[PDB]
Amino acid sequence: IGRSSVRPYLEECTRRFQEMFDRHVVTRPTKVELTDAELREVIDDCNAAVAPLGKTVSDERWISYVGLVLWSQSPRHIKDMEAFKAVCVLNCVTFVWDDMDPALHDFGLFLPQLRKICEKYYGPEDAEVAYEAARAFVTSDHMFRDSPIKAALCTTSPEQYFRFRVTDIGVDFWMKMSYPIYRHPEFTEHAKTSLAARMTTRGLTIVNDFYSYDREVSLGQITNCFRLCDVSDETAFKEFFQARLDDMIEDIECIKAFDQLTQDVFLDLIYGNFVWTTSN
């Protein structure tokens, strides 16, 4: 699996993902607009949060990361741009954290910076919800490095793998820091029960996994669902890829039973993630 690649399938799978979204989601992703002042505030807060780790990060790097939030959130339904900036900052600094050598992970310096971001942008209750989700996420990543649990869950079956990824891909965290953006009671409850995360995990993870496969297997990373099939066998791969598209479609069609605003947000997230993933 160390020298395997999905490169033969890259164009066809991209085309098929886009065809699926065009058929099943229809509504095209749009990019949330930040003013120059708002982007500056976001970048200032990102830099302050990773400064204690000695990180200098370029504006260009921060802006590439924040594009995920601008594309994946749902601009029609935004009601709180302070929460929106918080998600921009939290997303960005977690990306930088996840790219660092783990041996330099100083939780004592980083967790208080996450808390500071949450207390700046959210009300008291929401700040605790967002902070706990951020804490749980980065703590999980640390716990499962070389854990037998990760090996068991990621190699047993797609169901066990996606069960691990509800947390490990970050979508529970994303939902629990994003609901204040929308101030929509139903969405808030689905975020807090993690049903929102459970409904969107496969569509986010399958896309992310396909486009990270070559890099991740080159680094010995096992958290990728395409490791569960023999990608070098075109027949096995196409069968597995179709099964994953079927998973995404079943989730999308189930999401359409949610209330209109919630379904818009869930579907914008899955489709926006795909656009951002393929653009950068």
Residues lying near a copy of itself in the complex (CB under 8 A): 128, 132, 136, 139-140, 143, 148-149, 151-153, 156-157, 159-160, 163-164, 166-167, 172, 186, 189, 192-195, 198-199, 250, 254, 257-258
Under the binding rule (CB under 5 A), the answer on residue 67 touching Na ion is no
Distance of CA 11 to the CA centre of its chain: 23
At closest approach, how far in Å is the CB of 210 from a copy of itself?
21
Give the per-residue contact string, 17-56, with Na ion (x = CB under 5 A; - = no).
------------x---------------------------
Q: How many Cα atoms sit within 13 Å of 61 on the Cβ side?
A: 12
- Residues 237 and 197 sit within 8 Å (Cβ to Cβ): no
What six digits make up the tokens of 65?
A: 């990361």
What six digits make up the tokens of 222?
A: 């096992």
Annotated binding residue 216: yes
Distance CA 18, CA 41 (A): 34
Give the per-residue contact string, 221-260, with Na ion (x = CB under 5 A; - = no).
----------------------------------------
Distance CA 16, CA 157 (A): 24
Nearer of residues 65 and 131 to a copy of itself, judged by Cβ: 131
DSSP helix/strand/coil, 105: coil
Nearer of residues 51 and 143 to a copy of itself, judged by Cβ: 143
Nearer of residues 25 and 32 to a copy of itself, judged by Cβ: 25
Stretch that binds Na ion, among 110-118, 176-184, 242-250, 271-279 (CB under 5 A): 271-279
* Residues 130-155 as b or e (16 or more Cβ within 10 Å = b): bbebbbebbebbeebeeeeebeebbe
**Binding-site residues for Mg(2+):** 98, 208, 212, 216
